[PDB]
């Protein structure tokens, strides 16, 4: 008789465990997961794991699980996570559950400093996260030390100020108090609205080279493709929006991006590993497809569209500058600050780097 396969899948805040048959496909597994947690916006998510060669991988849904070399272990371990991000969370996300999972996943990336976040923004987000978890601030309940166990802000942010842990608690509490009245769902959504303007938000980075062999980063996201210089992941230098892209493919380390303008030249770049190249290609195709479905079935920051959030950031900057230990800032801080000095934000930069012809942009790519 067919022996059942034990599988364990974790979401950002839940653990699921069930048995599947040897002939179970990824789709069958996937559907069981989403059905259990009540999630229907399935297009964003996937089952992530690490195969028996130590490689991070997304499960194929049209393919039996016991055929994709998942580690021979009991149970099989999967992580249910977002593989794709909406273009604008405020316009797209529908379900509380979907919002929450995005919120948790993005927050994890901020707190671990995988996603760069400037001090004031980090503090504010942390205060929205507190609201999301504890609800309304209550002096009777949330006495001094109620945040002591919390991972509130990135460690980098603490290092560059003259505040102690105890003092950071105080700071966040104050802003927690400002959010009084905000429902937890709305807290999480506001968290995402702010986070999505971050330079590194929603971006997968990959090491690539141009013709002459310059080490560069490729950035793949919901908006299009970005090119970065090797030491600056915050500021893309060249951009191609999905709207200018017709087709993505690769062959032996050579990527070829075909244009919608048949008169334009192909965008061509190089990437070393085959395993990595596969995931690059999936991320491009998936993001490209979602982009199209939104359009045929000038972005501004949250701060600029939400005067209340704008005032909060500004007030934060005021409170913090007096505690700022400037010779303790990191490389990304310094980069972010120069960008700000130049009057840049995520969307102004994207418009800037998308200027000119395809040929023109392809040429400066090679010149890098």
UniProtKB/Swiss-Prot annotation:
Q: Where is the composition biased (Basic and acidic residues)?
A: 322-346
Cite the CDD domains for this sequence: ATP-synt_Fo_b (cd06503), FERM_B-lobe (cd14473), FERM_C_ERM (cd13194), FERM_F1_Ezrin (cd17239)
- Say yes or no: keyword Membrane present: yes
- What post-translational modification information does the record give? Phosphorylated by tyrosine-protein kinases. Phosphorylation by ROCK2 suppresses the head-to-tail association of the N-terminal and C-terminal halves resulting in an opened conformation which is capable of actin and membrane-binding. S-nitrosylation is induced by interferon-gamma and oxidatively-modified low-densitity lipoprotein (LDL(ox)) possibly implicating the iNOS-S100A8/9 transnitrosylase complex.
Q: Which Pfam families match?
A: ERM_C, ERM_helical, FERM_C, FERM_M, FERM_N
Q: What is recorded about the domains?
A: Has three main structural domains: an N-terminal FERM domain, a central alpha-helical domain and a C-terminal actin-binding domain. The FERM domain is organized in a clover-shaped structure that comprises three subdomains identified as F1 (residues 2-82), F2 (residues 96-198), and F3 (residues 204-296). In the active form, the subdomain F3 adopts two mutually exclusive conformational isomers where a row of four phenylalanine side chains (Phe250, Phe255, Phe267 and Phe269) must point in the same direction. In the autoinhibited form, the F3 subdomain interacts with the C-terminal domain (residues 516-586) and stabilizes the structure, selecting only one possible arrangement of phenylalanine side chains.
Q: Name the Gene3D superfamilies on file.
A: 1.20.5.450, 1.20.80.10, 6.10.360.10, Phosphatidylinositol 3-kinase Catalytic Subunit, Chain A, domain 1, Pleckstrin-homology domain (PH domain)/Phosphotyrosine-binding domain (PTB)
What species is this protein from? Homo sapiens
Topology with respect to the bilayer: Peripheral membrane protein
SMART domains per record: B41 (SM00295), FERM_C (SM01196)
The entry's localization annotation reads: Apical cell membrane; Cell projection; Cell projection, Microvillus membrane; Cell projection, Ruffle membrane
Question: Which PANTHER family does this one have?
Answer: MERLIN/MOESIN/EZRIN/RADIXIN
| Protein name stated in the entry | Ezrin
Gene, per the UniProt record: EZR
Any idea which UniProt keywords this protein has?
A: Acetylation, Cell membrane, Cell projection, Cell shape, Coiled coil, Cytoplasm, Cytoskeleton, Membrane, Phosphoprotein, S-nitrosylation
Q: How is its activity regulated?
A: A head-to-tail association, of the N-terminal and C-terminal halves results in a closed conformation (inactive form) which is incapable of actin or membrane-binding.
N6-acetyllysine: residues bearing it: 60
UniProt motif ([IL]-x-C-x-x-[DE] motif) ranges: 115-120
Q: Provide the tissue specificity.
A: Expressed in cerebral cortex, basal ganglia, hippocampus, hypophysis, and optic nerve. Weakly expressed in brain stem and diencephalon. Stronger expression was detected in gray matter of frontal lobe compared to white matter (at protein level). Component of the microvilli of intestinal epithelial cells. Preferentially expressed in astrocytes of hippocampus, frontal cortex, thalamus, parahippocampal cortex, amygdala, insula, and corpus callosum. Not detected in neurons in most tissues studied.
Q: Subunit structure, per the record?
A: Monomer. Homodimer. Interacts with PALS1 and NHERF2. Found in a complex with EZR, PODXL and NHERF2. Interacts with MCC, PLEKHG6, PODXL, SCYL3/PACE1, NHERF1 and TMEM8B. Interacts (when phosphorylated) with FES/FPS. Interacts with dimeric S100P, the interaction may be activating through unmasking of F-actin binding sites. Identified in complexes that contain VIM, EZR, AHNAK, BFSP1, BFSP2, ANK2, PLEC, PRX and spectrin. Detected in a complex composed of at least EZR, AHNAK, PPL and PRX. Interacts with PDPN (via cytoplasmic domain); activates RHOA and promotes epithelial-mesenchymal transition.
Query: What lineage is on file?
Result: Eukaryota, Metazoa, Chordata, Craniata, Vertebrata
């Amino acid at each position: 008789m067919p022996k059942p396969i034990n599988v364990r899948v974790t979401t950002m805040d839940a653990e699921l465990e069930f048995a599947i048959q040897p002939n179970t496909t990824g789709k069958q597994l996937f559907d069981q997961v989403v059905k259990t947690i009540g999630l229907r916006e399935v297009w964003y998510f996937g089952l992530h794991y690490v195969d028996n060669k130590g490689f991070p991988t997304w499960l194929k849904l049209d393919k039996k699980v016991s055929a994709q070399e998942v580690r021979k272990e009991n149970p099989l371990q999967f992580k249910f996570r977002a593989k794709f991000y909406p273009e604008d969370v405020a316009e797209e996300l529908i379900q509380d559950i979907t919002q929450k999972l995005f919120f948790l996943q993005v927050k994890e990336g901020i707190l671990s400093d995988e996603i760069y976040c400037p001090p004031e923004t980090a503090v504010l987000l942390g205060s929205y996260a507190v609201q999301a978890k504890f609800g309304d601030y209550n002096k009777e309940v949330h006495k001094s030390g109620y945040l002591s166990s919390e991972r509130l802000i990135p460690q980098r942010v603490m290092d560059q100020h003259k505040l102690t842990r105890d003092q950071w608690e105080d700071r966040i509490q104050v802003w927690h108090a400002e959010h009084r009245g905000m429902l937890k769902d709305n807290a999480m959504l506001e968290y995402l609205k702010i986070a999505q303007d971050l330079e590194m938000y929603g971006i997968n980075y990959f090491e690539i080279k141009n013709k002459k062999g310059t080490d560069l980063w490729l950035g793949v996201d919901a908006l299009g493709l970005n090119i970065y210089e090797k030491d600056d992941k915050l500021t893309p230098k060249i951009g191609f929006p999905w709207s200018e892209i017709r087709n993505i493919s690769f062959n032996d380390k050579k990527f070829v991006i075909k244009p919608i303008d048949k008169k334009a030249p192909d965008f061509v770049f190089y990437a070393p590993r085959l395993r990595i190249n596969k995931r690059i290609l999936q991320l491009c195709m998936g993001n490209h497809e979602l982009y199209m479905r939104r359009r045929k079935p000038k972005r501004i920051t949250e701060a600029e569209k939400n005067e209340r959030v704008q005032r909060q950031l500004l007030t934060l900057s005021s409170e913090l500058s007096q505690a700022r230990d400037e010779n303790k800032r990191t490389h990304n801080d310094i980069i972010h600050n120069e960008n700000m000095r130049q009057g840049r934000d995520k969307y102004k930069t994207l418009r800037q780097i998308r200027q000119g012809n395809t040929k023109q942009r392809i040429d400066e790519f090679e010149a890098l």
